[PDB]
Structure formats: structure tokens, C-alpha cells
Design a protein around this ligand. Structure first.
Ligand code: NA
Ligand code: NA
Ligand code: NA
Ligand code: NA
Ligand code: NA
Ligand code: NA
Ligand code: NA
Ligand code: NA
Lengths: 100, 98
């Protein structure tokens, strides 16, 4: 029937604060509001995240999971999720710090 | 090897929850040996899934999803993370503006 077209709104996500070398960290990007369907994009410090042996992105219909194993200093930085549907887009950026 | 005790990555609920929002939180280890099992509690009692409350557990994380959150969903949610070597629990408060 009538299809509501609602701009998406990202649920704010943040990284843990005393993360030390070698640990695993996960964050989720998901809408709190918005019409289906959703697309997700992850950025790190100005470029799209590239999956690797220790970095993985797993995207579902209504959320996307960023996983980093064996964190090191190179994994520190600002990670952004860009969320879109057919009505609009939203973005959230979270800073990851990695300590010795 | 394979006997590293689990430790949950601290999780928290958003601070902007209004009635009707979808909310998701994940429980996952920052350390610990695979395989894991997960349990969710609400105010000390295991979560009962329903039409608008879903628990989806994967190999290395568990997802709590609440559609159309309301005042009745407010409470203290615990994730219990288990493996062969031990157990950890983390609890976070879900608050809803009304
Ligand atoms: Na956090
Ligand atoms: Na998280
Ligand atoms: Na992932
Ligand atoms: Na760094
Ligand atoms: Na940035
Ligand atoms: Na976009
Ligand atoms: Na109880
Ligand atoms: Na799910």
C-alpha cells in the first residue's frame, strides 16, 4: 500500500576507551529510524575500509558490523559509517584509540 | 592453549532513545578462546524473545534487537559470555525518554 519514505538516522556508536594492543574490537552501525532498504559504507581516515586478514565488514539488511582483530596502532583513527536508503543519508564518526 | 578466559567488550545503550526507535546492542569478547556461548538477561531474568525483541547469537557475538522501543523495555540488560575456561558478565541500562 502506501509506503512511508523516512530518512535514515544512525544509532550513535563509539569505540571502547582503554583498548590495548592485540585485543579484538567490534562496532555496529544500524538505523534507529528510516525506511528500508539500507546500504552501509565504512570509512577510515578518509578512505573506504579495506577488509583484510584482521579487518572484516559484515553487512546485513539492517546493520553492519566492523571487526578488528589483534589491534595495533595502525588501526587507530576515525571510522565513519555512511547509511543510506531511498529517502536520504546519515553519517556517524567514532574515534578508535589504541594503547600499548 | 584454547583456555583464555573471556572478557566482554563494554557495551552501552544510546542516550537518545525515544518511543518507537529501533535499538541494537552487540555483546562480543575483546579476548577469550573460541567457542563461546551467550545469554542475555533483563533485570536478572533471561530475555524472552518476542515479535519486537530478538536475540541473534553468532559465533563471536550476540545481537540484542528491540523494535519500537518503549518504556516497558527500560531496564538493566546483562550479557553473559561463557567458554571452556570461564565466564564474564556485562550489564548496561536501557533508558527511554517519555
Ligand atoms: Na564504547
Ligand atoms: Na559495540
Ligand atoms: Na565484521
Ligand atoms: Na595510532
Ligand atoms: Na573523520
Ligand atoms: Na551517502
Ligand atoms: Na530477575
Ligand atoms: Na537479526
Amino acid at each position: 500500500g502506501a509506503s512511508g519514505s523516512e530518512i535514515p538516522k544512525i544509532q550513535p556508536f563509539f569505540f571502547p576507551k582503554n583498548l590495548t594492543t592485540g585485543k579484538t574490537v567490534k562496532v555496529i552501525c544500524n538505523p534507529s529510524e528510516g525506511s528500508l532498504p539500507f546500504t552501509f559504507e565504512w570509512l577510515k581516515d578518509g578512505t573506504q575500509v579495506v577488509p583484510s586478514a584482521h579487518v572484516a565488514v559484515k553487512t546485513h539488511e539492517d546493520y553492519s558490523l566492523l571487526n578488528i582483530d589483534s589491534v595495533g596502532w595502525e588501526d587507530a583513527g576515525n571510522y565513519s559509517c555512511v547509511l543510506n536508503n531511498s529517502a536520504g543519508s546519515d553519517t556517524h564518526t567514532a574515534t578508535l584509540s589504541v594503547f600499548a
